[PDB]
Write a protein that binds this ligand. Structure first.
Ligand SMILES: Nc1nc2c(ncn2[C@@H]2O[C@H](COP(=O)(O)OP(=O)(O)NP(=O)(O)O)[C@@H](O)[C@H]2O)c(=O)[nH]1
Ligand code: FES
Ligand SMILES: [Zn+2]
Lengths: 65, 321, 85, 27, 97, 161, 157, 184, 37
RNA sequence: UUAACCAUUGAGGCCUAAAAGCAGCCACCAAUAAAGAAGCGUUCAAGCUCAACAUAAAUCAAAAUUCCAUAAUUUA
């Protein structure tokens, strides 16, 4: 759609008040699953995914019953 | 009362080469009319619904012909309509001594012809006694039909507070001083249209087809029922009721029917009852031909007022046809 | 079916954990709604006072026991028998 | 059908005597 | 017992003890076409940021184009880390559509 | 099917049966073998650091019993506490104990009792902390330390004034 | 040992209990039986040892409290049944409700009873010489006890 | 994961064969979990179908695979009614493998083994190794001075009058078509 | 009560007992789950 | 080896209005001290609640005439 890729955008509220109200500067510049191999044991996200795999490992056995 | 049954025809016995001859035709399934009580037995007793027939004996030395197989039979209620899995009506055992070749036994295996053996046919057959009530109750959700059935009989009907409730119709026989029993069944409130089987659908609407006559409850509160935003008047509801009934089946509209006004207790309902008197009969501000049977009586189920009056009218129409 | 339930204990003294666990089980809002007649109350102090629990009924029966030598299961089971009356 | 205690003991005795026969026949 | 999902007939329990007009009124306060998480709790009433499902469809979406709606998420997933909700919509974003 | 074996052959099998060696003392009854060396999972190492980090950052550590409230309902209380910039901490105290054994705080072990939530902040809003406790009636307070001073609930309430 | 007394007010009072005799003959024994070198030297007749693990009404104490190993728990539990069925524990009888009385039948003397007498079927067809159906005596759990006979004990009679 | 993870079909039509220790299919080739024959028996095509249908339905194509470790039926049988595949004790009838633990495949493999014509068991690589280690351990630490081989080979007691010539090779582990594990 | 050679639990609520010389699986929620050896 | 505990969204989309861990198929998903969706529920979401957090311990070896010696667990 020509409008959405312009200033008109689905992201900005399309409310009756908003009505599609763009540039990188206008939005957080800093902001501009995963692979356990990259993750490090201690790192909270590692355990998260590893436990996801452990839970999936439990789900692997659990699903079969 | 709309159960289903699977069957399997017996297989054809394989022939004995070098002049042994034909094989016996496989056993075939013949549903046999018996005492009407058998329906309870069929659905509950012998729960396994597969009726299979013995295959014909294979041709033996000395050119013995096949035993012709062992047939299988299904006792069924009198008046049952035999229909295919697809819903096509194979036949109906309306009268006694009415056997039907529901399934075909395997063609007898003949070595001289092209096919040495041949396997028996097996199929799913619906055998159903959709409620043949003397009259049936058709209304939109929250109409009050269950409440109406509650007081005429002692059936403890499920009261549908919300739509899509009381899915299974509840059969109630109405006793009279003349010792005549009239069976009335209340189905759940139906949606507008339903020709596409939306929501509840017209699957249960086959039950009405069996019923000789139709009973129409007309909730006065239903008049201008906001719902999502249809805001249907009772006048509109009847027009929709007539239209939707015609779409499902033309004959249903022609079938004898009666009208039952409901929820007249409220004083505003009485004012609406005068509006109900206005709507139909004489032309109003319409918003195809439609049918008005005029067998309409004003009653209120909650107050139990005028219930006795309606009873008489129903019996008169029944005794007439 | 309980008019009021009172639990009393002294925190820093390391004598009874069962009383707290019974308080913890009582803390569970699940039963608190079932026995809506009673408003749960928890209080603590510093004195050398053995932990105690007091249950009050409308009929006037008061059930009081101390956790020093009572395990949470017993009181609970004792409560269930008393509630039946 | 199990084998008695008499039967198993007596054979082992005969085996031991025959075991010695092996040794004395080696020199 | 919120009816969370991306009046009288919908809310009959309320009669026993408004959202119909508030729904269409809020339908103006929301986009006509984008789904919304109906925070119609069970009985306080509230509603906030819309959902990412149709957002991608009508747009697919650039990083600038998505961070702007992240602020809409920030406007009311009440978790403080706004970066996290971005991943949330992102997680749904890949799965959805 | 089994085929019977000549007696003599059966006698041979009876005498050639395997005999296992028997120990003088069952290993179980004997003193337990020296414990196999245990290892510390990375989470525990990080967990240990987390407990050290919260103590270093937060001057006041108070102890309020846990209730295992629903996560979303817990977030409701947490949201109220977050509005007051007071944080909640929960830890597998099994690793907490080593620190308390040898640390500036050594008399708080009795206060810590299993399922007990922790209170941590940078400001001693003790009066508001009691006020936030009044939000949930049953929710009790066991004690702890405020501004590096160990005290019980009654002292904390007097300290609140 | 703590006992609950009721009055309603109910309270549990702790009383001092006798302690184990000091200086076990074989220290470093994990389980209590092994500490005193009793691994394979007790049978159902040894009430003095067995009674120590029995509740006042004849029930077995939990394994955790006694501390016995699983192997000896099973052995101790089995002998107690045989001790009970043999009428060796007359003071540890069940706590029949006040509305009940003993079965009032005469009691047949037993010993070395593996199974509960109520649920054993009679052997109508006993069988011939190398077909005999055997009547079990004793418990297999005690096969490892020290034996002072020429050959192992006859379990099946 | 092999592309043809599912078990292939087996063609219906192409005394000592089962009376001794096996010499083929005794080692895991690709999979980690397999069914071990504990006796001598003949596998007809009906058994082959049961193994094929049961295993194929359960196994996950993404994470599991299976292969056949025995030849198709080739031995004639007369009242040429049908052909039976001979199997010797110790043979691995079927092999399974993939990114799965043994416990997941234990139930199906054990269920399939029960319906086989001969006694069988489901064994992983570890379990098969453990079984052999236990067998060797029993032989080394046996406290019985006398063993079947020494008595038979040395003709002690005049035993060979009552023994078959094959008995010396088997050493009493195998009798007829049955395998006695505990017998050292 | 079916007398079967192998007794197997069929649901979580099923429990096992050893009464009158035999093994029983008794389920209060679903009496169909009862088996005797 | 179960102990008695606890279960945090944009409905992940799309083919069945729309399909919620979960009609169906594919992604295989969201922050957090900590949770992927396991049974299952659900028109779909009702949610009954598994695994986490958060707590404490944890594979085998002796049917038909009328039952049929008697008995017996330890003395070297
Ligand atoms: N005021 C009033 N209320 C009535 C009357 N008849 C029924 N109701 C009310 O209508 C409520 C809604 O249920 P109701 O319509 O009776 O049930 P139903 O007949 O099974 N409905 P459905 O048509 O969907 O099958 C009932 O709870 C009852 O109190 C009446 O004559 N007057
Ligand atoms: S022999 Fe030591 S635990 Fe019993
Ligand atoms: Zn059950």
């Amino acid at each position: 759609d020509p409008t959405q890729l312009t200033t008109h955008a689905m992201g900005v509220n399309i409310y009756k008040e908003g009505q599609d109200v763009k540039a990188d500067s206008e939005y957080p510049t800093w902001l501009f699953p995963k692979k356990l191999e990259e993750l490090e044991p201690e790192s909270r996200e590692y355990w998260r995914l590893l436990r996801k795999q452990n839970i999936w490992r439990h789900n692997r056995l659990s699903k079969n019953k | 009362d709309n159960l289903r049954i699977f069957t399997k025809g017996g297989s054809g016995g394989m022939g004995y080469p070098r002049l042994g001859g034909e094989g016996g035709r496989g056993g075939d399934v013949w549903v046999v009319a018996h005492k009407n009580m058998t329906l309870k037995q069929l659905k509950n007793k012998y729960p396994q619904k597969r009726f299979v027939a013995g295959g014909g004996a294979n041709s033996r030395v000395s050119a013995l012909q096949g035993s012709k197989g062992k047939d299988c039979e299904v006792p069924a209620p009198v008046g049952i309509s035999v229909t295919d899995e697809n819903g096509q009506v194979l036949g109906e055992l309306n009268k006694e001594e009415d056997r039907v070749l529901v399934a075909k036994g395997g063609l007898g295996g003949k070595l001289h012809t092209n096919f040495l053996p041949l396997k028996g046919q097996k199929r799913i057959v619906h055998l159903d006694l959709k409620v043949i009530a003397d009259v049936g109750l058709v209304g939109f959700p929250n109409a009050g039909k269950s409440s109406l059935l509650s007081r005429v009989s002692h059936a403890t009907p499920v009261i549908a507070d919300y739509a899509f409730t009381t899915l299974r119709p509840e059969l109630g026989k109405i006793m009279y001083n003349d010792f005549k029993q009239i069976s009335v069944a209340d189905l759940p409130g139906l949606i507008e249209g339903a020709h596409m089987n939306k929501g509840m659908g017209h699957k249960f609407l086959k039950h009405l087809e069996r019923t000789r006559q139709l009973l129409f409850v007309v909730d006065i509160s239903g008049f201008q029922l906001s719902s999502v935003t249809p805001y249907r008047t009772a006048f509109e509801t009847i027009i929709l009721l007539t239209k939707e009934l015609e779409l499902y089946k033309e004959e249903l509209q022609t079938k004898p029917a009666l009208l039952a006004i409901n929820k007249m207790d409220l004083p505003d309902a009485q004012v609406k009852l005068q509006e109900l008197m206005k709507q139909l009969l004489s032309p109003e501000d319409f918003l195809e031909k439609a049918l008005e049977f005029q067998h309409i009586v004003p009653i209120s189920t909650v107050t139990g007022e005028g219930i006795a009056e309606l009873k008489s009218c129903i019996r008169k129409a029944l005794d007439e046809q | 079916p309980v008019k009021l339930v009172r639990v009393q204990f002294c925190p820093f003294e390391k004598n009874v954990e069962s009383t707290r666990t019974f308080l913890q089980t009582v803390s569970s809002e699940k039963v608190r709604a079932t026995n809506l007649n009673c408003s749960v109350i928890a209080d603590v102090r510093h004195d050398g006072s053995e932990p105690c629990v007091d249950v009050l009924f409308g009929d006037g029966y008061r059930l009081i026991m101390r956790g020093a030598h009572l395990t949470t299961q017993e009181m609970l089971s004792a409560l269930a028998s008393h509630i039946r009356d | 059908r199990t084998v008695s205690f008499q039967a198993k003991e007596s054979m082992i005795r005969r085996l031991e005597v025959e075991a010695e026969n092996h040794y004395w026949l080696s020199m | 017992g919120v009816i969370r999902s991306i009046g009288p007939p919908l809310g009959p329990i309320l009669g026993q003890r408004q959202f119909c007009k508030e729904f269409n009124e809020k339908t103006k306060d929301i986009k006509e076409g984008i789904p919304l998480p109906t925070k119609i709790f069970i009985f306080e009433l509230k509603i906030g940021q819309p959902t990412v499902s149709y957002f991608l469809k009508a747009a697919l979406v650039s990083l600038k184009h998505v961070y702007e709606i992240a602020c809409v998420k920030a406007k009311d997933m009440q978790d403080v880390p706004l970066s996290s909700v971005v991943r949330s919509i992102i997680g749904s974003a890949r799965s959805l559509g | 099917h089994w085929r019977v074996m000549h007696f003599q052959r059966q006698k041979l099998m009876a005498i050639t049966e395997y005999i296992p060696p028997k120990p003088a003392i069952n290993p179980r009854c004997l003193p337990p073998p020296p414990k196999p060396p245990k290892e510390e999972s990375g989470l525990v190492r990080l967990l240990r650091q987390d407990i050290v980090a919260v103590f270093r950052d937060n001057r006041m550590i108070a102890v309020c019993q846990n209730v295992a409230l629903s996560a979303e309902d817990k977030l409701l209380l947490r949201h109220q506490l977050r509005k007051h910039k007071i944080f909640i901490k929960v830890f597998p105290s099994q690793v907490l104990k080593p620190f308390l054994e040898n640390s500036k705080y050594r008399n708080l072990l009795p206060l810590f009792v299993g399922h007990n939530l922790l209170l941590v902040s940078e400001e001693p809003k003790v009066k508001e902390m009691v006020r936030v406790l009044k939000s949930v009636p049953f929710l009790p307070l066991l004690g702890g330390c405020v501004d590096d001073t160990i005290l019980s609930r009654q002292g904390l309430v007097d300290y609140a004034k | 040992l703590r006992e609950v007394v009721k009055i309603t007010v109910i309270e549990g009072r702790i009383t001092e209990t006798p302690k184990a005799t000091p200086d076990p003959p074989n220290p470093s024994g994990q389980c209590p039986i092994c500490r005193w070198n009793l691994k394979h030297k007790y049978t159902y007749e040894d009430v003095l040892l067995l009674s120590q693990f029995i509740r006042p009404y004849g029930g077995m104490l939990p394994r955790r409290v006694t501390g016995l190993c699983r192997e000896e728990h099973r052995k101790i539990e089995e002998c107690v049944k045989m001790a009970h069925r043999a009428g060796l524990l007359p003071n540890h009888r069940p706590q029949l409700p006040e509305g009940c009385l003993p079965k009032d039948k005469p009691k047949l003397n037993r010993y070395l009873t593996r199974w509960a007498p109520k649920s054993v079927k009679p052997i109508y067809k006993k069988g011939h010489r190398w077909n005999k159906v055997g009547m079990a005596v004793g418990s297999p759990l005690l096969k490892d006890n020290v034996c002072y006979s020429r050959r192992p004990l006859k379990m099946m009679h | 994961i092999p592309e043809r993870s599912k078990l292939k079909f087996v063609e219906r039509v192409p005394l000592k064969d089962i009376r001794g220790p096996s010499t083929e299919a005794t080692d895991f080739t690709e999979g980690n979990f397999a069914i071990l024959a504990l006796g001598g028996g003949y596998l007809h095509w009906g058994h082959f179908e049961m193994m094929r249908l049961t295993i194929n339905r359960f196994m996950d194509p993404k994470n599991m695979f299976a292969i056949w470790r025995v030849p198709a039926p080739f031995k004639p049988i007369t009242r040429i009614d049908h052909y039976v595949t001979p199997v010797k004790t110790g043979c691995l009838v079927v092999e399974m493998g993939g990114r799965c633990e043994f416990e997941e495949v234990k139930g199906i493999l054990n269920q399939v083994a029960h319906k086989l014509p001969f006694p069988a068991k489901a064994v992983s690589r570890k379990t098969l190794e453990r079984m052999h280690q236990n067998q060797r351990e029993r032989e080394l630490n046996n406290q019985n001075p006398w063993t079947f081989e020494h008595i038979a080979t040395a003709n002690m007691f005049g035993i060979r009058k009552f023994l078959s010539p094959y008995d010396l090779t088997q050493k009493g582990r195998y009798w007829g078509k049955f395998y006695m594990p505990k017998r050292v | 009560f079916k007398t079967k050679g192998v007794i197997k639990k069929r649901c979580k609520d099923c429990y096992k007992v050893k009464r009158r010389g035999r093994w029983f699986i008794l389920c209060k929620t679903n009496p169909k789950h009862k088996q005797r050896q």
